[PDB]
């Protein structure tokens, strides 16, 4: 859903945040107060493992939720789209209003075990 994709992901960074830090709520409340909750700033990265099996409207509604975090200026977001193939399939599935959100600084790096042998 939109819900547990948020909630598990906030949980997964939070234990990663306490382990480097040496009660709270698992949503975007931590994201703004991360400057005060943990001192130093935040640069998270999103290893979307198998991206074409997900219902894309959930992914499209997910990225609009991340769009609201762009007004705090102490956090930096980075997305990694590990597709299997077929980039043209992916620009078909999403909402076109979000592709224009995506198309700011895209980089189509190829990673293939078989690349020119």
């Amino acid at each position: 859903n939109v819900r547990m994709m948020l909630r598990r992901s906030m949980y997964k960074l939070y234990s990663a945040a306490d382990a480097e830090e040496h009660d709270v709520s698992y949503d975007l409340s931590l994201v703004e107060n991360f400057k005060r909750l943990f001192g130093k700033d935040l640069a998270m990265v999103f290893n979307f493992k198998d991206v074409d099996s997900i219902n894309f409207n959930t992914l499209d509604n997910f990225i609009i939720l991340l769009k609201s975090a762009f007004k705090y200026d102490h956090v930096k977001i980075s997305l990694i789209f590990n597709i299997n193939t077929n980039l043209s399939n992916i620009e078909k599935n999403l909402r076109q209003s979000t592709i224009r959100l995506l198309k700011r600084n895209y980089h189509k790096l190829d990673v293939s075990s078989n690349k020119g042998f």
Binding site: R3, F56, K92, N93, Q96
Partner: protein, 436 residues
Amino acid sequence: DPGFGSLQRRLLQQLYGTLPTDEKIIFTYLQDCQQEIDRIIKQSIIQKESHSVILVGPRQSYKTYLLDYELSLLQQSYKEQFITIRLNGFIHSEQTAINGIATQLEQQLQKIHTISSGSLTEVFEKILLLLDSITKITVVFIFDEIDTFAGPVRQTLLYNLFDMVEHSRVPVCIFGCTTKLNILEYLEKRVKSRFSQRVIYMPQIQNLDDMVDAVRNLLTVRSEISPWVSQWNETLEKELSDPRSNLNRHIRMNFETFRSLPTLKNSIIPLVATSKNFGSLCTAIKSCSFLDIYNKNQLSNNLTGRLQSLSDLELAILISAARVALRAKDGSFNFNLAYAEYEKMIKAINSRITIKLWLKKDVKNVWENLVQLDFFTEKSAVGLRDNATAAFYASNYQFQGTMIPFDLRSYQMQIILQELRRIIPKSNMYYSWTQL
């Protein structure tokens, strides 16, 4: 002058009814109904009656406005004599409402001068033993949307308070407010036998003359505050006495469609605050042209101004979208059938004459706004669930329509083809395509 602005202070709080409780004004078409309510409520506290009632009437019918009016009418003279407990059926479920009662009980005790502590059924037998059991404190219950408590499954909370009528030495009174009309069949047998069966229906504006009499009592100020007042009072009725006056004309429209006073009461609030001097306000109620602009804005984007505010292509896609929709039996149509139809339609304008036919990869960006402008719907999509746990059962359900691609989600129609001809002007070139 501030005296004109002081008149704005008086007139506005008169339109909200936020006066002190001596001067709150009840309209004439319900003065009988508050008195029988008064005969119920004041002999329940003073004469220690233990009888219940159900208020029933449609929404926005002064029902919650009537009851706290009695309380404020009794708060002035019977201060310590009673406490009120108010429960909404909306804000309270079946089981937290027990905690709703007990927590609202103990905060009255400090106001009148260990209960909420324990389990939910531990505090439940507590308020059972505290209620069932110089003078005794009486307790007034205020229930909003009591029909939702009257569900099929348990109906526990109704069964306890209605038995408190029968046995408790503490004098109580129950006030159910709802809008489901046949409330009595919604109850089962064993609860209705506890019920004292007395319901009271709420009145409506039965004649055109009634709300005309109401708005006169609504707008007229009787207390002397401003020098403008005596001038202001006769301007009001002179508009109201004339049946050909525009304010009297437009009230007739409100009697027709809505026949509900707080709809019209809503309209006057910007009309009397938009004036800046005294004379402009008198012309405003003389002209009532602002009501036209007001009813314009309330109408401006439900369905028609949605249609007027689209470009040339967005019309042309949707016009093709209905001409496909007329062909099939259910009226459903895919994106490929639209596009094909769109292309065929285009292949007619140039041949009868210079219009940029767009591609495939771009119509999707226009197709995105059309579905979220609700001009189309998905074929089998229950839009809004009623309550929370029915919506939560729809969230876990993985769907099949997303698993077929974007251009094959079988979109159906919201606005039918024949109605497009009546709204689209003939000056537009696609007017030959509205009709088949």
